[PDB]
């Protein structure tokens, strides 16, 4: 069980303040799940302020779907994401 949330990261002057992990065909971050996950959130950064949490599974970035994605596809999505990053996540309870 869990919930889906869409968080909006408002970038400031210190970067997004997250790390992402996982992806199809590489070592799973969590169990045998090959999804993209949030593996780090900087405490003082804008992702923390928006409400993103470690362990959130990343479903979309600015509406671009990442279900079944390889790691580099999520990296590319975040690189292109701009000043306000809308991040749809699944948060296991």
């Amino acid at each position: 069980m869990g919930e889906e949330l869409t968080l909006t990261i408002l970038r400031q002057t210190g970067g997004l303040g997250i790390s992402i992990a996982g992806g199809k065909g590489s070592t799973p971050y969590k169990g045998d799940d090959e999804g993209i996950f949030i593996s780090r959130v900087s405490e003082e950064g804008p992702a923390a302020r928006a409400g993103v949490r470690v362990g959130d599974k990343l479903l979309e970035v600015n509406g671009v779907a990442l279900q079944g994605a390889e790691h580099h596809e999520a990296v590319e999505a975040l690189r292109g994401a701009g000043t306000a990053v809308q991040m749809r996540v699944w948060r296991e309870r």
Binding site: G15, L16, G17, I18, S19, I20, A21, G22, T27, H71
Partner: peptide
Amino acid sequence: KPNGLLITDFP
């Protein structure tokens, strides 16, 4: 090709 646990940081 990167292998293992892939983690990419956006500081």
